[PDB]
Amino acid sequence: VKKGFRAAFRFQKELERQRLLRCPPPPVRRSEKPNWDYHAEIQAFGHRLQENFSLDLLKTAFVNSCYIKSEEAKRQQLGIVLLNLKSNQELSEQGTSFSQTCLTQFLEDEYPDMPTEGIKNLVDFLTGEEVVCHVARNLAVEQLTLSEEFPVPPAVLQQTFFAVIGALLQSSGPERTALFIRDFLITQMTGKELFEMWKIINPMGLLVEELKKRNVSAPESRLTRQSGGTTALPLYFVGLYCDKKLIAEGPGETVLVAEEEAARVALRKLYGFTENRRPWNYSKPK
Amino acid sequence: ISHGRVFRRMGLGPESRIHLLRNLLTGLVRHERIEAPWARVDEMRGYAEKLIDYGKLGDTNERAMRMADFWLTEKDLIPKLFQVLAPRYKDQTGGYTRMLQIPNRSLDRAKMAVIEYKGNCLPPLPLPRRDSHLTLLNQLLQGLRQDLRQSQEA
Amino acid sequence: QLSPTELTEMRNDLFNKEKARQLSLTPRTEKIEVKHVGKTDPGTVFVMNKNISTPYSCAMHLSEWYCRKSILALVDGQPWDMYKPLTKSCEIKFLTFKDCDPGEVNKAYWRSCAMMMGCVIERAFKDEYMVNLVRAPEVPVISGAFCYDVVLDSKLDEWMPTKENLRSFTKDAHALIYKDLPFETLEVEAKVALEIFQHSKYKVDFIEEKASQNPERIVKLHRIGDFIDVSEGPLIPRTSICFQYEVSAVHNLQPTQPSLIRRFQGVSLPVHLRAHFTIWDKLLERSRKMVTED
Amino acid sequence: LVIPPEKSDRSIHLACTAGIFDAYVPPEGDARISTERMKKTMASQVSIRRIKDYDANFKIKDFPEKAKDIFIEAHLCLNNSDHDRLHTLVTEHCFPDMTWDIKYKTVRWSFVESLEPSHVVQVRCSSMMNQGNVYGQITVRMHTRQTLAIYDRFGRLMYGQEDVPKDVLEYVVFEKQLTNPYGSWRMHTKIVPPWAPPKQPILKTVMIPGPQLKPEEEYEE
Amino acid sequence: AAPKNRRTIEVNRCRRRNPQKLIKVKNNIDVCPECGHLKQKHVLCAYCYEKVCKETAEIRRQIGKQEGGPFKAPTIETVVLYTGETPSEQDQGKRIIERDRKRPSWFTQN
Amino acid sequence: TARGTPSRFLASVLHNGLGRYVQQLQRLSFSVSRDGASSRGAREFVEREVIDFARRNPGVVIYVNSRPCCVPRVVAEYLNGAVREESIHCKSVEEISTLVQKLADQSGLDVIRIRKPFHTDNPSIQGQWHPFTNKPTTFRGLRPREVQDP
Amino acid sequence: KSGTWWDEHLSEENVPFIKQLVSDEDKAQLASKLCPLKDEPWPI
Amino acid sequence: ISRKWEKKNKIVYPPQLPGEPRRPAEIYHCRRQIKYSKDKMWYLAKLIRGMSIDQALAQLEFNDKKGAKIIKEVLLEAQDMAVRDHNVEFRSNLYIAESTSGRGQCLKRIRYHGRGRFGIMEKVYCHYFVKLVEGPPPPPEPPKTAVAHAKEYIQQLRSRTIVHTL
Ligand SMILES: [Mg+2]
Ligand SMILES: [Mg+2]
Ligand SMILES: [Mg+2]
Ligand SMILES: [Zn+2]
């Protein structure tokens, strides 16, 4: 038994760390953790985004329907009106409706050649749960969200995020809110491809219909390049020709796959979603 | 190079091998069922078959009596050989003994076998029996056998 | 009328409807005492659930050897399917292929492979041709093969399957063996059976014949996968029991004037009694010869 | 372990008896209702008087209500394995019976309703000064609806159902140490009539093995 | 000779856990039809052989009592009889061994 | 070393700085000791530096808790969820201010090896190189030693 | 899964029959090749 | 010493929800201070690993090693323990989930050599650990096929990027 206290104390902390790794505690709300002031965090939420939020509207944005019902249930259990708390359903509807119209306006102006089917899917992608929740979690919306179940369900978190936009819509107006949507939802299409966001089936069939609307003859598929045809690792470049003029070309391991890829390349050029297209202009409007 | 060697190497030498088999053979005649290591029983089995052949020569044969005198260390078994075992197999030209393998010995995990003279008074060994003729495979072959005999007569 | 794909779906729903109907008749989980009267492990008593537990579940209490070796069960001196739920306290005995007198087991295996072949025949021909299963004749095992009476479309009147066609049936049957589908048995009233097989004239006559013999007019229905057929008696538990299976030949029964009845034939052996390559060829030759029930 | 070391002034202090002084056999057909009577009542009255000697402020009429509360709280302790409180509600003869078989099992017991008010059927006391202690046992007839749902070690349903109450008619025996100033009425045991209906069957199936015979032995009918 | 270096556990595991040094699963195990216990195909059942040996030991003890000493081997055949049995015509003139038990079912009288 | 430690590619949080810049630091939790000698610099920071620092960072919530402690620490929490705890034990006011300012400027991503000192979602504009980029085409696409119209 | 041999499951009656059956077939097959020049021989 | 294996049978799980799947019964049993070598016991423990309860007993019964009887006795008392105490319906519905040997406390003795020299021998002891899980034994992993190899190789070729560039 060696004399001392610091070495024993230091080893105890190491054992505590190992015990946490072996049996991780369940995640809990940041509000339940120490060093939390909800009023202070609400004000900093607006200041980080450089937006002049209204405190009355912003607080109601994070109040969900499930939280209100759970709060009412707890009062009944304890036998304890003062609970006239307004939910975020009204703000979310305003926020969701404005966001879809704002995103549609941005995409129509940026890609006039894109049909309404393509624009709708892009708007649905940007407003989808996967994209919205990823933005909401990294903007500290989840911490301020008042929900019955933790972690906040993606359906509930998405409703909360659009409630914040709805609260910002009344606080600042449509012109200021459009920049907020542009700075956080439009940016999500940075490296994403057109068909990585707009999933389609049988692109060749859709390509033929587009050319008919443009009074262009049906494309002809021909092999422009070929390598290792009889081997297990082939390469094929199928080119689409309209009136014996090349419109697109695509590689693939098989003729069928390469031909399908060429149709996708043709659709990207027609719709303006080329990889080397003009980048989005994030500069301040003149 | 043990090509063509039919005799095992057991005991302390050639003479010790005979004495070891003789003690097993003497025990086999008295009890008509003994158990021993499989190799020793298999080696002794050949001598047990030929001992009965000497018994069929009769006690009046000097050579048979001398052979029975040597291989039966207990002299009360000599009358038994010529008057019990030999008359028992009068109508048999061979197959006097049956050798079966029993589970390994508990001590040294040695391969053990049981050898007995057929027709003894002791309770029968659990002899292995082939599948019954009423099984699915045997019924199909029986039907095939009947078909061939019918065609042969026709 | 109904398409062949829809015809199976209607039968399965009716089959499951009756099966769940019989399940609800059981009040809670009533206990039954099943006494083991077999040679091995004598005096064993199984406290099983009425109308739920099966003789296979009783075998699971003993060991894995009972589960693998037992092919048919003997309940109160009567043959009983391994997966047929027990309905009352009784005495149970397990039968194997290697018994002294495995007469009941041989009948069950032959009645089971005939059903397997019947499933192959129905799904083998194209949708253009119509296939109607008649029955599974009860031929002795010593006859060398099991047979199944099948009536095809009038178009296939002058057509005889080739050697490759026979090998096609064998591959389909081996696929059924690979699936390892247990034989599900269900005893229903005659009225329920007629509704299931109302689209086939031959089955209706067959069901009526079985119902007439029994005073209560109850028939036995067996199913593997999606194929439902009426069987003359108990069957083997699972299709995995069969190891060597082959369709030998097809013969046209006489007289052909009323209708052309084709008798598919084949020979099979279980895993426990698999034969050598040389011997199996000899049994194939005998199975190709036409067999006449007596 | 049977007997402590010999020649010791200190002796083991028992807080309850090992059995019932006089078993109360309920009349046959009592469940259908849901000279000798006077003799049993007179014997009960004598034991009541001795009980009232140690505790003057004791009423027979209030006991069935008190017994009902003890019965409910004692079984509710099994749900949360509150063994500390259970010892104050049941005797040392009753504690092993309740808890030994549920040590590694989850028990969900609840009280729904009382079909018939509890009636005291027998009050009796032990022989005076058995070892300086006098015990009094009271048997209470209970006909109530209860719900039981026992789960095994892995949280799988094992016995009973969680939402279906069933009628229970049992005779609960209570006991108190009269000589002990701090003694209190606690559950002692239960009486199972021979005519009681069998309990509900268990969920799983059980195999009862036959005799294990040595090779020398043979099976007999 | 002595090892030049210590052999590591990684090297030792490869040698020790090689399939040549691992126990091989046996496939010749089957259930004895008479008693239900396990046995090998080429080996007599342990349970049944013990059953025969137990009865054989009892018979041999009774043989010694009649002989009453060494070198007392009879010059006639031997027949074992049980309770409720009498010598047959073919058993006349043979030594009789009596067992105070009912004849086992598997011990067929000849 | 690099092999014995994890690695990642250069990236940002929600494409920060593309549309607008959002300060990734979200919360600072200080633990100072009223009487602790090792917390002398921490107390000096709270008296005169933390008030001005809060003015310049309205988006960061700073919690100063005065409790007995031998090793004062500051906990930084970022928007992406990363939590970083730094010790200010026996640090002067200037050293603490430099450390606090360093935490505010970081994005919150793990401080580990970065494989590439650059990141781009569109590395190519004219088209990524493939083996047929600089290979001329032949008439009818005939392969070498191929006969046409046999 | 257990290994098997040709006469494992054969009964007492079948073993002599199977041995006779295969032996007769082998002799018949060998006797059928005794005239190679009468069975379409290859050019000499 | 450590006796954590005996404490693994005392874990009481919360009751399952009506929709939750059936949880297989887990039984932990062991024998302490076996007069056998852990190296020799490992082969027997490795042999029955993954087998069913009945197949493991069959293999051990006809094994000439001394530890085969010891392990078989442990399985027999573990199989009875499952049905009697751990609420297992069918005693044959078990398989060997875990089975391994561990070193036990050993005694040191002196072995005499020539020329007045000696060596220290140890009286080796070992522990046997077994875990039984209710249900049919898991199927063995099928061998990797040519299709799997080709699919994996193509996936490797489709995951390579241009390194040391943008
Ligand atoms: Mg040799
Ligand atoms: Mg030697
Ligand atoms: Mg050493
Ligand atoms: Zn046996």
Coordinates of C-alpha atoms in Angstrom, one line a residue, chain B residues 34-118:
Chain B
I34 CA -13.9 -63.9 -22.2
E35 CA -13.1 -60.3 -22.8
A36 CA -9.6 -59.0 -23.6
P37 CA -7.9 -56.4 -25.8
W38 CA -9.0 -56.6 -29.4
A39 CA -5.5 -57.5 -30.8
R40 CA -4.9 -60.3 -28.3
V41 CA -8.3 -61.7 -28.9
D42 CA -7.8 -61.6 -32.7
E43 CA -4.4 -63.3 -32.3
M44 CA -5.9 -65.9 -29.9
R45 CA -8.9 -66.6 -32.1
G46 CA -7.0 -68.6 -34.7
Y47 CA -5.6 -70.9 -32.0
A48 CA -9.1 -71.4 -30.5
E49 CA -10.4 -72.6 -33.9
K50 CA -7.6 -75.1 -34.3
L51 CA -7.9 -76.4 -30.7
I52 CA -11.4 -77.8 -31.5
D53 CA -10.0 -79.5 -34.5
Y54 CA -7.6 -81.4 -32.3
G55 CA -10.5 -82.3 -30.0
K56 CA -12.3 -83.9 -33.0
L57 CA -9.3 -86.2 -33.4
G58 CA -10.3 -87.9 -30.1
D59 CA -8.7 -88.4 -26.8
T60 CA -7.2 -91.7 -28.0
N61 CA -4.9 -89.8 -30.4
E62 CA -1.5 -89.2 -28.7
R63 CA -0.7 -86.1 -30.8
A64 CA -4.1 -84.5 -30.0
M65 CA -3.7 -85.2 -26.3
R66 CA -0.2 -83.8 -26.3
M67 CA -1.4 -80.6 -28.0
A68 CA -4.3 -80.3 -25.6
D69 CA -1.9 -80.9 -22.7
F70 CA 0.3 -78.0 -23.6
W71 CA -2.4 -75.4 -24.5
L72 CA -4.6 -76.2 -21.4
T73 CA -2.7 -75.1 -18.3
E74 CA -5.6 -76.4 -16.1
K75 CA -5.8 -80.1 -16.6
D76 CA -9.5 -80.3 -15.8
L77 CA -10.3 -78.6 -19.1
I78 CA -8.7 -81.4 -21.1
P79 CA -11.6 -83.8 -20.5
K80 CA -13.9 -80.8 -21.3
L81 CA -12.3 -80.3 -24.7
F82 CA -12.6 -83.9 -25.9
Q83 CA -16.0 -84.6 -24.3
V84 CA -17.9 -81.3 -24.4
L85 CA -16.5 -78.8 -26.9
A86 CA -15.5 -81.3 -29.6
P87 CA -18.8 -83.3 -29.6
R88 CA -20.6 -79.9 -29.7
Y89 CA -19.1 -79.0 -33.0
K90 CA -19.3 -82.5 -34.6
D91 CA -21.6 -81.2 -37.4
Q92 CA -19.6 -78.0 -37.9
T93 CA -16.6 -77.7 -40.2
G94 CA -15.6 -74.3 -38.8
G95 CA -16.7 -71.0 -37.3
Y96 CA -16.4 -72.3 -33.7
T97 CA -16.0 -68.9 -32.2
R98 CA -17.5 -65.4 -32.7
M99 CA -15.5 -62.3 -32.0
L100 CA -17.2 -58.9 -31.4
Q101 CA -15.9 -55.5 -30.5
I102 CA -17.1 -54.0 -27.2
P103 CA -16.5 -50.4 -25.9
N104 CA -13.0 -49.4 -25.0
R105 CA -11.6 -50.4 -21.6
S106 CA -12.2 -47.8 -18.9
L107 CA -8.6 -47.6 -17.6
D108 CA -6.3 -47.3 -20.6
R109 CA -8.9 -46.7 -23.3
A110 CA -7.8 -49.9 -25.0
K111 CA -9.7 -51.5 -27.9
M112 CA -11.5 -54.4 -26.3
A113 CA -13.2 -57.5 -27.9
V114 CA -15.3 -60.4 -26.6
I115 CA -14.8 -63.9 -27.9
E116 CA -17.0 -66.9 -27.1
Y117 CA -17.6 -70.4 -28.2
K118 CA -20.9 -70.7 -30.1

